[PDB]
Amino acid sequence: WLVDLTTATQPSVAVPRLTHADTRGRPVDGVLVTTAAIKQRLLQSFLKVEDTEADVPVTYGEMVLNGANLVTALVMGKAVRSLDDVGRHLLEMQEEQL
Amino acid sequence: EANRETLDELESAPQTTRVRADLVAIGDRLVFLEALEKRIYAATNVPYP
Amino acid sequence: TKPLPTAPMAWAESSPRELAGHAPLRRVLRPPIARRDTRATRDDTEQAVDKILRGARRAGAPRYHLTRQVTLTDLCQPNAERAGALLLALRHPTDLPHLARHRAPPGRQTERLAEAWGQLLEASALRAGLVSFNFLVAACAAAYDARDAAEAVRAHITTNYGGTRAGARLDRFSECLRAMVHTHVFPHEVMRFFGGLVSWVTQDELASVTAVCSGPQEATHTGHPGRPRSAVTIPACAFVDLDAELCLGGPGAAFLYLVFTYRQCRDQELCCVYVVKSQLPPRGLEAALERLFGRLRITNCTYAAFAELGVMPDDSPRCLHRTERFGAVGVPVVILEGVVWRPGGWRACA
Amino acid sequence: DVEFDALLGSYCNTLSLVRFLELGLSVACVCTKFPELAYMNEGRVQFEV
């Protein structure tokens, strides 16, 4: 019956940056979560604990930002340079994201 | 880098020229005063709209 | 004094918005709009001078309206009762014998209210004073539903109040209350709300009671620097919910009310003062009075009269039901928590 | 407005490339290929018993 749980789910799309693993380094494919009343039961007769300490990532993730970059720029005087600053402040701003 | 190139053209591009067109001051406002049936619709059976 | 849980420790100081709001205004710039394109004391008192400077270099905090009144100690006792009780102001009783001559229905003894009030002045002396709430419970104690805790109210009043024969003050003022409804001068026409106790000043035969006529309770600096805190206490006979008796168990701010019940019979007239806690509109309250108290409706013009007393601002309001000590007497007392006082006017019968 | 991003913790598995010679079934075949089969009419295989 346990073997049915494990095989009922089709694997998922995501591939994580790091992978929870053994001491040996073998990867870990998923998580049973039960009450403790059952866990005690299973660990006697129906299973064996083949590792004790596991390796787990620490840092969270972050995101890469490619956004819509908008401007509202105060302006004093109207000329090409003052206007080209718009084009300039764009590049300045898009230069910042990278 | 590509987008900079485009800003480099409109920076370096020829800006404005000198053209004959009638400019009338009405109120305080300047105006192009224009009738196109010469420069365009002349000698073409397209009716002047 | 600048600890390092900073974002809360600066938040309790009254923020970063006031710094950032003064940043675009005042920190920058020349804009707004510009051109275009002597061994023990001193330094003990000397740092106290600097504490005044610490009082002056700086200065949420809710507001109040404290009130004081020079109050005779016949009916109420602000020494016997602790800080945090209800209080009740009165009209001046020289209007009592004339209004009873015009508001009492024909065939009723209009001389009775002037006589019953006159016997009280000679019984507490063996001038518009103040009625404390606990004193009022033992007066109307002979009309209640829970009669044993009304005797617990009567157990400490006869032993802790200042005066001679405090039980004779009770049984005469309860006779005054039976003369109120009989002469149709209803007690809500006389009893006016005066704010909750914070402190009082002792003097012979009179006391100067301070109270909050409008505002919250627990952050008044009581005078005691160790405890500027005093919870609101109510005896168990008067505390009536409408969340349990009407199955309204939802969270929300709970209002506090005073309610009189009137029974108009031939020389057997009841009075009951209740404190009603509710989640209701005050206009959505008279229908709830019809459901409960229809017994005094038939025996009688309405049987009920009520006014606002205060608001608990809690989402889930918290009440206590304990047995405190007034001297040596254990009284089942409903202790309320977090009360913001806002008074109002009574509602009519005739 | 609109927004965009990309994770750095998890990457997909788009293709699952299955080769027939990775399978256990490839014993039962004799996988010899023509690059010219469509040009062929009836081909024959002989047996001598």
**Subunit partners of chain C (3 or more CB pairs within 8 A):** A
Tell me the C-alpha distance between C212 and C21, whole Å. 35
Q: How far apart are CA A54 and CA A19, in angstroms?
A: 10
Instruction: For the beta carbon of residue C22, count every other beta carbon within 10 angstroms.
Output: 11
Residue C314, CB-side half-sphere exposure with 13 Å CA sphere:
14
Judged by CB atoms closer than 8 Å, whether chains meet at B11 and A94 is answered as no
C278: nearest Cα among C286, C270, C267: C286
Nearest CA in chain C to A83: C37
What H or E segment, with its residue span, contains residue A87?
helix A80-97
Q: CA-to-CA distance for C127 and C114, rounded, in angstroms? A: 16
Q: Which two tokens stand for residue A65?
A: 């930002």
Please report the residues numbered 4 through 43 in chain A whose beta carbons come closer than 8 angstroms to any beta carbon of chain D: 13-18
Cα–Cα distance measured from residue C181 to residue C178, given in angstroms and rounded to the nearest whole number? 6
Q: Are the beta carbons of C209 and C69 closer than 8 angstroms?
A: yes
Please enumerate in sequence order all residues whose Cβ is within 8 A of that of C135, keeping only pairs 6 or more positions apart, or say none.
Answer: C75, C76, C77, C157, C161, C170, C173
Distance from CA of A71 to the nearest CA of D (A): 13
Bridge partners, residue C278, by sequence:
C255
Cα separation, C232 vs C291, in Å, equals 28
Q: Is the peptide bond before C29 cis (omega within 30 degrees of 0)?
A: yes
Whether the Cβ atoms of residue C310 and residue C340 lie closer than 8 Å to each other: yes
User: Is B5 an interface residue toward A (CB < 8 Å)?
Assistant: no
| CA–CA gap between residue D4 and residue A65 (Å, rounded) | 6
Contact B3 A80 (CB under 8 A): no
- 3-state SS, residue C232: strand
Count CB-CB contacts under 10 A for residue C40: 7
Interface of A with C in 39-98 (CB under 8 A): 75-77, 82
> CA C273 to CA C288: how far, in whole Å?
16
Q: Which residues of C105-127 are buried (b: 16+ CB within 10 A; e: fewer)?
A: eeeeebebbbebbeebeebbeee
Closest CA relative to residue A6, chosen from A38, A28, A25:
A28
Burial of residue C247 (number of CB atoms within 10 Å: 0-12, 13-18, 19+): exposed
Which helix (H) or strand (E) segment holds residue C256: the answer is strand C254-262
Q: Which residues of A touch B (CB under 8 A)?
A: 80, 84, 87-88, 90-91, 94
Residue to mutate among A10, A56, A59, A64, with most D CBs inside 10 A, is A64
- Identify the three-state secondary structure at position C130: strand
Helix locations, chain B, DSSP H: 2-12
Residue A41 Ramachandran class (φ > 0 left, ψ -120 to 50 alpha, else beta): alpha
What gap in Å lies between CA C345 and CA C307, rounded to an integer?
5
AA letter at D8: L
Size of chain C in residues: 350
Residue of B10, C184, C213 lying closest to A84 (CA atoms):
B10
User: Which one, of C228, C239, C237, C253, lies nearest residue C315 by Cα?
Assistant: C253
Q: Scan for tokens 């006589």, then name that residue.
A: C115
Phi–psi pair at B34, nearest 5 degrees: -140, 135
Contact call for D4 and A66, based on CB within 8 A: yes
**Do residue D6 and residue A16 have CB atoms under 8 angstroms apart?**
no
Name chain A's partners: 3 or more CB pairs within 8 A.
B, C, D
Residue linked to tokens 């905090």? C61
Is the Cβ–Cβ distance between C331 and C146 less than 8 Å? no
Q: If DSSP codes are grouped into helix, strand and coil, which group holds residue C273?
A: strand
Chain D residues lying within 8 Å of A61, measured CB to CB: 7-10
User: How are beta strands C271-278 and C239-241 bridged, if at all?
Assistant: parallel
Q: Which residues of C285-320 are buried (b: 16+ CB within 10 A; e: fewer)?
A: beeebeebbeebeeeeebbbbbbbbbbbebeebeee
Mutate to test the interface with C, among A76, A80, A81, A83 (most CBs of C within 10 A): A76
Given A17, A62, A64, which is nearest D10 (Cβ)? A17
Rounded Cα gap, residues C173 and C247, in angstroms: 37
Chain A contact set for D4 (CB, 8 A) = 65-67
- CA of residue B29 relative to chain centroid, distance: 18
Burial A11-44 (b: 16+ CB within 10 A, else e): eeeeeeeeeeeeeeeeeeeeeeeeeeeeeeeeee
Do C197 and C81 meet the contact criterion of CB atoms below 8 Å apart?
Answer: yes
Q: Which helix (H) or strand (E) holds C158?
A: helix C147-160
- Residue indicated by tokens 């209740």: C274
How far apart (Å, rounded) are the C-alpha atoms in residues B11 and A11? 54
Alpha carbons C173 and C179: distance in angstroms, whole number: 9
Chain D touched by A67 (CB under 8 Å):
yes
- Do C and A share at least 3 CB pairs under 8 Å? yes
d(CA C243, CA C280): 9
Residue A3, token pair as written in the block: 């073997």
Give dist(CA C283, CA C344) in Å, integer: 13
In chain C, whose CA is at the least distance from the CA of A79? C37
For helices C147-160 and C166-182, angle between their N-to-C axes, nearest 10 degrees: 130
Name the burial class of residue C284, with classes exposed (0-12), middle (13-18) and buried (19+) by CB atoms within 10 angstroms of its CB.
exposed
Q: How far, in Å, CA of C96 to CA of C176, rounded?
A: 11
Contact A77 C35 (CB under 8 A): no
User: How far apart are the CA of A72 and the nearest CA of chain C, in angstroms?
Assistant: 15
User: Which of C275, C258, C272, C252 has the alpha carbon at shortest distance from C336?
Assistant: C275
Question: Exposed (0-12), middle (13-18) or buried (19+): which is C160, by Cβ within 10 Å?
Answer: middle
Chain A partners within 8 Å of D15 (Cβ): none
State whether residue D3 sits within 8 Å of chain A by CB. Answer: yes
Coil, helix or strand for C144? coil
Shortest CA distance to C92 belongs to which of C58, C121, C129, C66?
Answer: C129
- The single-letter DSSP state of residue D19 is -
Are residues A91 and B7, on separate chains, in Cβ contact within 8 Å?
A: yes
Q: How far is A12 from chain D (nearest CA, A)?
A: 9
Residue A60: count of CB within 10 angstroms of its CB: 6
Q: Is C37 on the interface with A (CB under 8 A)?
A: yes
Task: List the strands of the sheet with C87-89, edge to edge.
Answer: C130-132, C87-89, C192-194
